[PDB]
Design a protein around this nucleic acid. Sequence first.
RNA 1: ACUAUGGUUGGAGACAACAUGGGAAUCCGGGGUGCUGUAGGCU
RNA 2: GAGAAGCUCAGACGAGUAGGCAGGCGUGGAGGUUUGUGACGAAGCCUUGGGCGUGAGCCUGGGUCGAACAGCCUCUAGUG
RNA 3: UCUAGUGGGCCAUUUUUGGUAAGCAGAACUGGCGAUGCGGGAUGAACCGAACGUGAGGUUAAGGUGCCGGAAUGUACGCUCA
RNA 4: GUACGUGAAAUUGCUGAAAGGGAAGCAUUGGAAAUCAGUCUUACCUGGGUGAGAUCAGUAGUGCGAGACUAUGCACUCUGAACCUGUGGUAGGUCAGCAUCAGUUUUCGGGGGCGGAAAAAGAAUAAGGGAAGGUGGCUUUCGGAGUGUUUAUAGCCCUUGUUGUAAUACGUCCACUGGGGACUGAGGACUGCGGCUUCGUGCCAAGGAUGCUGACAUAAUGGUUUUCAAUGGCCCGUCUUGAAACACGGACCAAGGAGUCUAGCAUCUAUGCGAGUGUUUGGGUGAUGAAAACCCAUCCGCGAAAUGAAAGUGAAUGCAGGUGGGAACGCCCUUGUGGCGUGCACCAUCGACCGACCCGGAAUGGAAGGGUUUGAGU
Lengths: 200, 51, 186
Amino acid sequence: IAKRAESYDAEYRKAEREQIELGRKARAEGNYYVPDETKLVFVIRIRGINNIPPKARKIMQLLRLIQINNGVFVKFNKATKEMLQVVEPYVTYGIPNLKTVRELLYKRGFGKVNKQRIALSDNAIIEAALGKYSILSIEDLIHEIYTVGPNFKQAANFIWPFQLSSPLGGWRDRKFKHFIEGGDAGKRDEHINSLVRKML
Amino acid sequence: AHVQKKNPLKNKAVLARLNPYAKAYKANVKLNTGKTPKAAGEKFLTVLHEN
Amino acid sequence: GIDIERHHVRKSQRSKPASENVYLKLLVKLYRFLARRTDSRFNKAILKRLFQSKTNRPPISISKIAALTSRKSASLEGKTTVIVGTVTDDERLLTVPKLSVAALRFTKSARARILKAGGEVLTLDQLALRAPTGSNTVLLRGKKHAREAYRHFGFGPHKHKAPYVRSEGRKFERARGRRKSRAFKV
RNA sequence: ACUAUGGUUGGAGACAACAUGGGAAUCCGGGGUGCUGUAGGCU
RNA sequence: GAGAAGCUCAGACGAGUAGGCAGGCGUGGAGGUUUGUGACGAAGCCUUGGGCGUGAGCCUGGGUCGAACAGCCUCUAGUG
RNA sequence: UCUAGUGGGCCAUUUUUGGUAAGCAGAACUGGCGAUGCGGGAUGAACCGAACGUGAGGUUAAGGUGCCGGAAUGUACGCUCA
RNA sequence: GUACGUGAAAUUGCUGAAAGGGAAGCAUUGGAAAUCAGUCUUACCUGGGUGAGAUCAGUAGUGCGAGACUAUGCACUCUGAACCUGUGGUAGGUCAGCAUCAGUUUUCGGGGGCGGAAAAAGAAUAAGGGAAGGUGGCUUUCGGAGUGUUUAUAGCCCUUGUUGUAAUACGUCCACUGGGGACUGAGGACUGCGGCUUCGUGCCAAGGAUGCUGACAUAAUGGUUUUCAAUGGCCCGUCUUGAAACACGGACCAAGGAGUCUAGCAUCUAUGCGAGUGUUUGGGUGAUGAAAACCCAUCCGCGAAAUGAAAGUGAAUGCAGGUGGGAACGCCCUUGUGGCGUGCACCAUCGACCGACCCGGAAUGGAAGGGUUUGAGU
Ligand SMILES: [Mg+2]
Ligand SMILES: [Mg+2]
Ligand SMILES: [Mg+2]
Ligand SMILES: [Mg+2]
Ligand SMILES: [Mg+2]
Ligand SMILES: [Mg+2]
Ligand SMILES: [Mg+2]
Ligand SMILES: [Mg+2]
Ligand SMILES: [Mg+2]
Ligand SMILES: [Mg+2]
Ligand SMILES: [Mg+2]
Ligand SMILES: [Mg+2]
Ligand SMILES: [Mg+2]
Ligand SMILES: [Mg+2]
Ligand SMILES: [Mg+2]
Ligand SMILES: [Mg+2]
Ligand SMILES: [Mg+2]
Ligand SMILES: [Mg+2]
């Protein structure tokens, strides 16, 4: 498990360096390096349970976003993207970095064990549930979520939807306009990480 | 078993129970030990300052 | 607030018999233990049926037992038949074969005819000793929907169920709405 | 153009702008002016 | 052992009219049981004292009083 | 499977029809009140926020922070005299 | 004390307590005053002082092997058994304070890695360009106003070199690190996962608080009552879309006061018996004591056959059939949500059989042959 963790660290660091080197090369030549689109998105429900129309209410149920300030990891594809478009006023989402993923799992990570919410306080709980997918530890689980590994569906579903607090420091003045309009709803790109720091 | 959740980010002993790699984890590696070239380019800077 | 919709929340099954029979309580005690300390679906089947009401535990006769255990491709030759319920007699079966049956109750006529044909009658606790996991046993049930009420359930236009009538004959619901010569048929 | 969704947006209102999405018609211009199956005939 | 009608570990959840179901509280009378309470004070009542229960209610000190009355398992109803 | 209550609704957003208009009448969609307390809109069934077991601590929504009143008689640039 | 057992409430007088600026009542929280409970450190264990005493462990003997018990003696005293004392120990409430931890959290720092135009600037320095002049100078006139030339005795702007791996800001990350504050301490022998170890039933911050002190103990903390202050609280019941309503009922208190019993029916449950079931129309022990219990015959009801208006007729081709799913069981795999074989219940489905009906169909009978049909059937 330690050896797997070390190789994951080297993998994250290697991918990050290559992104910097490719950007530097493009700037030098005067061309443009278009980075890879995100495969992972973190979604936080910002609206309570009142006054929700039927389609959005169903979509948030399918997203396991049943309570305000709940959070989930979602694999980003065309099917997921169109679902998030319908619930843009009711959620906010963006690209989480490595610190967000590992801290969500270390501090607020709970596993669905026999349909019960169990704290991830020992690597045995992870191995019992996801050992068939070669996931033996919390770092194995973090790596699977962050890199969207081939067993992302089983790993992400095993994680209970995160029960975040209200953000320390509050929200923006008006929560329920789009992030582009200076509100809090909808896609906010890497700013999802600053929001999670206040909520985790 | 498990009467009280302990945050591994605060309780170092719990962080050792999970993640055996934490002991050997080396943060803050220096990679700028070389001459540190500049990568801006002539075309990039003339595009940057237009208008 | 949480947005939880709850449909299958409370389990709909019996967790114990409604009966106050002390000996049924002793049988439940035996099969609570057996269903818990073995991996046998047979023992969990017996425990569940020990809870059931009378209408959910229909009787079975020795004719049906003899027929079910004597099929052409049976191999149910020398195996114990088990029913959580009453075993009745079928006087139409003039000659009873040799049968081994475990049951809650045996009718006096059923018990006498089983024994006279060289067979054997067991209670469910005797069965637990002989086959503690129900191995090489034929678990059987009587016909649940043979009771009168199922002639009537679902009565409605063109459902071909039996009406509730105080008497049978002409003048008792065989007129307008039951034939073409009287407005319409059903 | 229109439109799903959004705001304790603007405006007395009529409406309008903006935000996350979907997206015409018409006219005009260029190009084109039958293709093909079955069976059989034909300097 | 832990009234197996018991014991033990864990997780999620909690608006409610009309309405539905369950488990309880209290009252008159009946069977059973409790070497049950009682003129050395039953029942009832008052209380500027105490205790128990989420609650229906229950127990108790002091005062008043004078002939009966209660707990437990069941039965029952002109039962709040 | 058996059975109860119900078979007077009403408010808002948005699409509407009738009407001079209406705190008007009638329909469409969703959310609500009825059966919903709580923070806010001085007040208020329906508007905003949020839906509730008994409590401790923390943080928020909508909305606020001269005094009544918990919270800057805060910061920056203008406009305005009634 | 006959205005007589008990002697409630409404309502009233006296006494006491308390409060009171156009209602009162209630809720939350504390103050004040009044009032209530701790009876602690009892039990059990050991030690210390003296005291007296039928004296205790192994044994001898009285159901064969092992174990418990009583009983006759011995063991005759550093042992064992009862009793006396000490303001004996662990002291026991109430409340504080600090420390070391754990859980949650808030607030303030320090160090470092990386990123970007490998920031933009900037400083000092070497090579350039330029126009506004400090106007250096020129000049109305020895007392200052206007010119008209690109560094003078000033300065500025725009380009490139290094000393560059410049700094700094910002962004991001550190399983880097240092403090301050608050709330909580659920659980109760052990067991786990980790770490550290002198490798051991050792140590730790690692499956939830301990340690160290002190003061009080007609105090304190809790409880109760009244009242005050601050904040909130409209009058209940009802019909209603909607009641605080200028909608109706309600001055007050006691006692009474409304889903019952019966003939049925339906579902569900329990009990007995089961192809049957039902002793209470009756009759008997029966007279003693008998509205009960208990016993006993023939009928009869419902069920064991349907269908048809009726006259009538009346249920197996077959393992009482075939197909699909399927409980339970058995066998094979090989670790899968397996494959294989029987197949209860139930549902869907293709047939067969009985009655009705519609057919042809070789005086009375309707046998074989049929049918898209029909029945509360088999
Ligand atoms: Mg704050
Ligand atoms: Mg706000
Ligand atoms: Mg719009
Ligand atoms: Mg809105
Ligand atoms: Mg409720
Ligand atoms: Mg009475
Ligand atoms: Mg008395
Ligand atoms: Mg009083
Ligand atoms: Mg209590
Ligand atoms: Mg009554
Ligand atoms: Mg203030
Ligand atoms: Mg008020
Ligand atoms: Mg109503
Ligand atoms: Mg009212
Ligand atoms: Mg009225
Ligand atoms: Mg009226
Ligand atoms: Mg009146
Ligand atoms: Mg009364």
